[PDB]
Design a protein around this ligand. Structure first.
Ligand SMILES: NC(=O)[C@@H]1CC[C@@H](NOS(=O)(=O)O)CN1C=O
Length: 260
């Protein structure tokens, strides 16, 4: 098996980006940590945080029912497609978008809170000047080489996760909620979760896009040691490239070994 990030990139082809932070010591494991990558679904973690942050000023926000129609449904909406008739609450849409990566849920939340610009504004509010959300689902996953729309860096996303999950960017109640949503990711078993020991607990958000883009970002809680924050981004040369779950699992093993 490839033993370094550089070696893994050469084996897999494409372009790999990693930022892993050992929160005990502040040591980092890095590869292209300051390069931009298309974030795809991983922004949904930021979207959830942005909604929770708005809920601090308006506690009733999470309660609000959002109704949407058949024509609002975009591809990959396994939860929202079941509730065209009732609609769903803001909190329900957050859980759906983070835990099942539901695309319509993301769009409907963004309509409520002020669109792509609102998520970008939220990123700036927590000290992320790098993140930019430009488009809606599913266009934001085009992942075109050379396009800066809908990108961030592994280092910027890892820093966001550190302050959101382990820091005080959110008040305790909202911080606890974000953690519950991330720990409940249902669609990431073959990625970060596949590259850590089963004793480690994971809260994460995956993403996948065109150009075989394969991403996963989150926080890892080892049983007897301080948490590690891990952001992994990966993208490939051909537009029809296949996503590579195993690249993320391998990057995770290397990061966890390095910070052992
Ligand atoms: N093209 C997309 O919108 C992809 C693919 C399917 C959904 N979930 O994928 S995941 O890698 O986030 O688990 C949503 N998504 C997020 O990147």
């Amino acid at each position: 098996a490839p033993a370094s990030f550089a070696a893994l990139e050469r084996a897999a082809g494409g372009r790999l980006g990693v930022c892993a932070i050992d929160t005990a010591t502040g040591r980092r494991a890095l590869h292209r940590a300051d390069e931009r990558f298309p974030f795809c679904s991983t922004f949904k973690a930021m979207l959830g945080a942005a909604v929770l942050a708005q809920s601090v000023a308006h506690p009733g926000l999470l309660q609000q029912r959002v109704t949407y129609g058949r024509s609002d449904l975009v591809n990959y909406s396994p939860v929202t497609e079941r509730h065209v008739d009732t609609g769903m609450t803001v909190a329900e849409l957050c859980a759906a978008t983070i835990q099942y990566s539901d695309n319509t849920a993301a769009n409907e939340l963004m309509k409520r809170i002020g669109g792509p610009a609102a998520v970008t504004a939220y990123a700036r509010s927590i000290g992320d000047d790098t993140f930019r959300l430009d488009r809606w689902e599913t266009e934001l996953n085009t992942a075109l080489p050379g396009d800066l729309r809908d990108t961030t860096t592994p280092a910027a996303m890892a820093a966001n996760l550190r302050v959101l999950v382990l820091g005080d960017a959110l008040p305790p109640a909202q911080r606890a909620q974000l953690i519950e949503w991330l720990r409940g990711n249902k669609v990431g078993d073959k990625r970060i979760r596949a590259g850590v020991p089963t004793g480690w607990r994971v809260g994460d958000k995956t993403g996948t896009g065109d150009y075989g883009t394969t991403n996963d970002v989150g926080v890892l809680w080892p049983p007897s040691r301080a948490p590690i924050v891990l952001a992994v981004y990966y993208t490939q040369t051909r537009a029809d490239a296949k996503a590579k779950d195993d690249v993320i699992a391998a990057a995770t093993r290397i990061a966890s070994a390095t910070l052992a």
